[PDB]
C-alpha cells in the first residue's frame, strides 16, 4: 500500500456508488482549538459488500468515474 484511508461508511444504498466518511482532528490555524474536519470520498466496491456503518480501509486508484478515484481494500466491523 502507498498509503490507505479508514473512515466509516455513511452510504451503501447504491450499485457500487459507495461513499465513505473520513474524520481528522485539526488544530485551528488561528485559534488553536482542535476541530473535526470531515472528508467524504466516492469509493468503488465491486459486488456491493460493505454496509452503512462499516469501518473500511481504502486506497487511491485511477478514475473509475467522474467522482471515483478510490477502491476499497478491506472491511472492518459491522452492525454498528
Amino acid at each position: 500500500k502507498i498509503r490507505t484511508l479508514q473512515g466509516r461508511v455513511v452510504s451503501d444504498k447504491m450499485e457500487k456508488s459507495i461513499v465513505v466518511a473520513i474524520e481528522r482532528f485539526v488544530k485551528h490555524p488561528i485559534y488553536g482549538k482542535f476541530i473535526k474536519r470531515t472528508t467524504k470520498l466516492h469509493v468503488h466496491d465491486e459486488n456491493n459488500e460493505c454496509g452503512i456503518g462499516d469501518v473500511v480501509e481504502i486506497r487511491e486508484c485511477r478514475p473509475l468515474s467522474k467522482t471515483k478515484s478510490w477502491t476499497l481494500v478491506r472491511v472492518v466491523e459491522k452492525a454498528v
Binding site: 485551528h28 488561528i30 485559534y31 488553536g32 482549538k33 476541530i35
Partner: protein, 123 residues
C-alpha cells in the same frame, strides 16, 4: 469571548470610512466651479469664508475651500482640489490648490508661498 465563539465568527476589523472621497484615493481632483459662495463659520468663530461648490471630473459635486487672502475665481473656473477639511465650516472637506489650473496664487505672499502657490519674487 469563547474559543468556539471566535471559531464560528472570527474577530472582524472595522473598515475605514474615508473623510475625503476625492474618489479613488487620488492626490487631487479637477473640477468646475458651480457657485462661488462665501459663508460664515461655526460657534466660536465669526467671518466671511470664501468657498466654491465644484463639479468634479468624476461627477461628485463638492464644496471646497479657497485658501489665502483674495482670489479671482468665478463660476466656470476650472480648479484643482486636495484633501483638507475646514472645521469652522462644517461640510467643507477639501481645499483648492492655489496657482493651479485657473486658480491664481495669493497676491504678494512672501512667507510660505509654496502653499498658496506664489513664485519666488524677483528678489
Amino acid at each position: 469571548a469563547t474559543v468556539n465563539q471566535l471559531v464560528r465568527k472570527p474577530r472582524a476589523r472595522k473598515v475605514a470610512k474615508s473623510n475625503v472621497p476625492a474618489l479613488e484615493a487620488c492626490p487631487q481632483k479637477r473640477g468646475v466651479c458651480t457657485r462661488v459662495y462665501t459663508t460664515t463659520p461655526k460657534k466660536p468663530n465669526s467671518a466671511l469664508r470664501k468657498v466654491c461648490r465644484v463639479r468634479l471630473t468624476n461627477g461628485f459635486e463638492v464644496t471646497s475651500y479657497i485658501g489665502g487672502e483674495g482670489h479671482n475665481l468665478q463660476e466656470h473656473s476650472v480648479i484643482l482640489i486636495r484633501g483638507g477639511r475646514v472645521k469652522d465650516l462644517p461640510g467643507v472637506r477639501y481645499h483648492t490648490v492655489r496657482g493651479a489650473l485657473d486658480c491664481s496664487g495669493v497676491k504678494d505672499r512672501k512667507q510660505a508661498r509654496s502653499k498658496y502657490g506664489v513664485k519666488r519674487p524677483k528678489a
